[PDB]
């Protein structure tokens, strides 16, 4: 499905509730541990983005390759190390990741009106 990046105008994602606000408990480059994220939020933010309001990034976020809940708050493994050194406690915005599998698109948002998905051919 072309729900793809959420909030795209063609995609017409609901947005709203899934998006979350977080801060970084620890700075580990790609594997920085974060706080303010629920265990439920982890694995739903998998394939998501982690825009960092704090610091030079100023809302620029490396894609989160994997989100796994860990003690001390969810540890986020980014696809790539963030540009610039990111301080712990930097403000961050947590975003959902859409697998784009037709079933996943349906389960998470069910945008039948705007699903560019061709599951059965």
């Amino acid at each position: 499905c072309d729900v793809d990046r959420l909030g795209d105008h063609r995609c017409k994602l609901a947005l709203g509730p899934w998006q979350s606000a977080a801060t970084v408990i620890e700075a580990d480059g790609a594997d920085l541990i974060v706080s303010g994220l629920d265990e439920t939020a982890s694995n739903i933010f998998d394939r998501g983005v982690l825009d960092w309001t704090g610091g030079a990034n100023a809302g620029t976020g490396s894609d989160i390759r994997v989100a796994r809940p860990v003690a001390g708050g969810v540890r986020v493994s980014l696809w790539s190390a963030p540009p610039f050194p990111i301080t712990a406690g930097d403000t961050a915005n947590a975003t959902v990741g859409c697998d784009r599998t037709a079933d996943t698109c349906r389960n998470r948002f069910d945008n039948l009106a705007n699903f560019r998905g061709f599951p059965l051919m």
Partner: protein, 48 residues
């Protein structure tokens, strides 16, 4: 050339799958033997 171990770490993929149904199932037919009186509109109705 810049390279990252993290960049090469695997996401694991989406594992997309599509449902499929194939062929038909054999059965034992319930054959019924009928002995109705022969009727008009049927060709050669004697020993049928």
């Amino acid at each position: 050339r810049g390279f990252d171990r993290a960049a090469y770490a695997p996401s694991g993929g989406v594992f997309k799958a599509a449902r499929a149904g194939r062929l038909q199932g054999s059965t034992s037919s319930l054959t019924r033997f009928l002995d109705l009186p022969l009727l008009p509109g049927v060709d050669a109705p004697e020993w049928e």
